[PDB]
Amino acid sequence: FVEMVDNLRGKSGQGYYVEMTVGSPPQTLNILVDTGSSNFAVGAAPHPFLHRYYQRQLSSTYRDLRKGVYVPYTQGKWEGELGTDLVSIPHGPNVTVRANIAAITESDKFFINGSNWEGILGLAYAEIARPDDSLEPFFDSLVKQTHVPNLFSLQLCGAASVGGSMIIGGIDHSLYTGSLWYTPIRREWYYEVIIVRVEINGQDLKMDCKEYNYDKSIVDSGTTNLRLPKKVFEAAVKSIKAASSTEKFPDGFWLGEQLVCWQAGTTPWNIFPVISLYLMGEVTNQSFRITILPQQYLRPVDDCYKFAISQSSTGTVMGAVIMEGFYVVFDRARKRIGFAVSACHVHDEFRTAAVEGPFVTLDMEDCGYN
């Protein structure tokens, strides 16, 4: 699918977006690819931060649903008017579908000043769509209305400008090396998965794996960091702090309350441990592990970086920190997510991200939270 290669762009920390068109004639917009939500929402008014916006008055195929939607966040939020219209992805499958579209008429802390995107494409399932699971997510409409396979894959390459590929309806084997390894999608709402073991430099935290997924563990392209439950994060950092004991860093650093800087290319990468997450495999008692480097959780912001690992109350969230090291296949058809070493991931000549298996892991089910 050469046509779809390199169809993602963005700026460090501002997420990855793909070009899309909405309405008739087609109105072009850059839309954030978010596997962590399920609403297709686009700016529809002249907010100062927006390069452009959806103008419903110019679309002959626009249809009003006469319903509003308010989506609150920890601080900001977005609110819009629901409708449907014809949507297409220029550098994606050659098709056009009628999908729900929330026209954003008011928001706070949603749009980013200086960013180049005007909307968000929630690729998750209806269960978490707003206002409720009755609002059919875009991908569902795309598959239901066309012959596009129920699957998509993401290769986030993270470089201030970033790039990547979203292969819609398939897999592009040139984007990865080695074999793809699959972990089951526990439940179809967020792209939930189960982490069965966690290793730092090869030594595991030996913590009731159930904690690792309290109350969730998800794969989300819309989040920059690797979010971990408090308990897991506490021990996580504890081990990383011990591995990197070579140098001393402030407590704020580990809490993302302050940045850490190093002179021109003087970052002590080797001082930091690799993080290995073992994921539930496809077979009983079988697992595999994906391993990332500081290159992923120690990202640039001298050279100042922010610890890309943080705590959560919503569970584990495998964001760009994890994804930028692998080619990730969202195999909706088979309810599984595949990981393979990405052909574009950044690595030093000493350590490289990897996906290895099979491994024997017992009681993987006790890792899932109910």
Curated annotation (Swiss-Prot):
Residue positions, PTM N6-acetyllysine: 67, 206, 210, 216, 230-231, 238
Q: Which gene specifies this protein's sequence?
A: BACE1
* Topological type in the membrane: Single-pass type I membrane protein
Output the Gene Ontology terms for molecular function.
Answer: amyloid-beta binding; aspartic-type endopeptidase activity; beta-aspartyl-peptidase activity; endopeptidase activity; enzyme binding; peptidase activity; protein serine/threonine kinase binding
| EC code | 3.4.23.46
User: What is known about its subunit structure?
Assistant: Monomer. Interacts with RTN1; RTN2; RTN3 and RTN4; the interaction leads to inhibition of amyloid precursor protein processing. Interacts with SNX6. Interacts with PCSK9. Interacts with NAT8 and NAT8B. Interacts with BIN1. Interacts (via extracellular domain) with ADAM10 (via extracellular domain). Interacts with SORL1; this interaction may affect binding with APP and hence reduce APP cleavage. Interacts with NRDC AND NRG1.
Which species is the source of this protein? Answer: Homo sapiens
User: Which of the residues are on side Extracellular?
Assistant: 1-370
Name listed for the protein in its UniProt record:
Beta-secretase 1
The record's Gene Ontology biological-process terms are: amyloid fibril formation; amyloid precursor protein catabolic process; amyloid-beta formation; amyloid-beta metabolic process; cellular response to amyloid-beta; cellular response to copper ion; cellular response to manganese ion; detection of mechanical stimulus involved in sensory perception of pain
Report whether Metal-binding shows up as a keyword of the record.
no
